[PDB]
Amino acid sequence: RTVLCIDFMVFTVRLLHIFTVNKQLGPKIVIVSKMMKDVFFFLFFLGVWLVAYGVATEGLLRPRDSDFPSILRRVFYRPYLQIFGQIPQEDMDVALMEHSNCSSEPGFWAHPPGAQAGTCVSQYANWLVVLLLVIFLLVANILLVNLLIAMFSYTFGKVQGN
Amino acid sequence: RTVLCIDFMVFTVRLLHIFTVNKQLGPKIVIVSKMMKDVFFFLFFLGVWLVAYGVATEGLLRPRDSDFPSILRRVFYRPYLQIFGQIPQEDMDVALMEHSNCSSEPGFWAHPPGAQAGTCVSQYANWLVVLLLVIFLLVANILLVNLLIAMFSYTFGKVQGN
Numbered sequence: 579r580t581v582l583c584i585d586f587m588v589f590t591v592r593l594l595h596i597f598t599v600n601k602q603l604g605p606k607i608v609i610v611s612k613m614m615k616d617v618f619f620f621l622f623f624l625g626v627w628l629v630a631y632g633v634a635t636e637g638l639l640r641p642r643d644s645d646f647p648s649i650l651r652r653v654f655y656r657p658y659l660q661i662f663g664q665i666p667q668e669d670m671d672v673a674l675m676e677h678s679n680c681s682s683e684p685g686f687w688a689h690p691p692g693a694q695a696g697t698c699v700s701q702y703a704n705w706l707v708v709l710l711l712v713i714f715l716l717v718a719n720i721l722l723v724n725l726l727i728a729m730f731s732y733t734f735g736k737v738q739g740n
Numbered sequence: 741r742t743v744l745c746i747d748f749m750v751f752t753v754r755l756l757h758i759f760t761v762n763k764q765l766g767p768k769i770v771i772v773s774k775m776m777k778d779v780f781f782f783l784f785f786l787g788v789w790l791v792a793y794g795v796a797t798e799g800l801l802r803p804r805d806s807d808f809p810s811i812l813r814r815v816f817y818r819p820y821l822q823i824f825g826q827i828p829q830e831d832m833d834v835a836l837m838e839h840s841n842c843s844s845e846p847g848f849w850a851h852p853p854g855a856q857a858g859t860c861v862s863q864y865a866n867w868l869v870v871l872l873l874v875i876f877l878l879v880a881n882i883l884l885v886n887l888l889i890a891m892f893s894y895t896f897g898k899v900q901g902n
Binding site for chain 2: 615619622623626629630631633634637638663665667673674702703706708712715719720721724725727728729731732
């Protein structure tokens with residue numbers, strides 16, 4: 579069943595062949611094919627930034643879950659959704675979560691309300707985690723996305739004739 | 741540990757040197773370097789607008805927390821997140837929060853449900869706070885962001901050859 583569901587995606591994508599017939603849509607699809615160079619540049623740039631921000635935030639928070647599937651989720655998945663307006667402030671900002679004792683390790687700890695945000699996170703320098711979130715949103719949600727729009731606009735005008 | 745986490749960010753950023761080898765990615769990175777003039781203009785314009793809107797909203801609400809770390813959060817941090825779809829309407833709109841008596845100061849007061857939104861805020865002219873939010877979203881989320889896209893598009897086309 580699982581592979582068939584993915585197989586349905588391939589069949590549905592084949593439907594794009596219809597628009598090649600139309601005079602005003604055929605050129606559009608060809609231009610779309612030529613945008614892959616711009617998309618790959620954005621993905622590689624985004625991938626580097628996600629790794630840098632994701633690991634640093636995970637390293638600063640020090641969640642006590644420390645599980646490989648969960649660590650990958652907090653490093654890659656959670657920052658990725660922050661690009662699309664999903665910002666779980668209650669899972670990184672210590673001021674939004676109650677303080678509690680969870681581990682015998684020295685320092686202070688806070689208990690996030692999220693299910694996959696870890697049992698408890700460190701609060702040594704949480705202003706930096708907030709600051710990193712501020713910088714990440716500026717670079718990803720604004721600088722990178724607007725850069726891709728400019729790259730798309732230039733490419734569309736250049737390859738329109740060909 | 742804290743500085744090492746930031747140090748990891750610097751090491752990861754160095755990875756962008758790889759794309760300089762590729763023929764179709766090397767020029768892209770150079771153009772990115774030349775976009776800093778546009779970014780600085782947007783940041784300075786945004787910084788002025790955040791200060792203007794942030795302080796006025798804080799001044800109108802008159803939250804009773806009145807703590808310097810919290811005041812800075814409500815002046816800079818909260819309006820910044822409003823750009824990226826994080827609009828805590830229950831923390832400024834009085835109609836969304838219950839009315840209660842918190843201080844002996846004359847007037848009427850309401851109790852926000854937020855943890856860092858202040859113990860209670862004034863409700864003298866709350867329609868203006870809502871109106872300021874409407875104007876802020878128009879200028880920031882629409883006018884400034886779309887302006888930066890246009891500035892990026894013009895710069896990308898101009899410096900492509902060089």
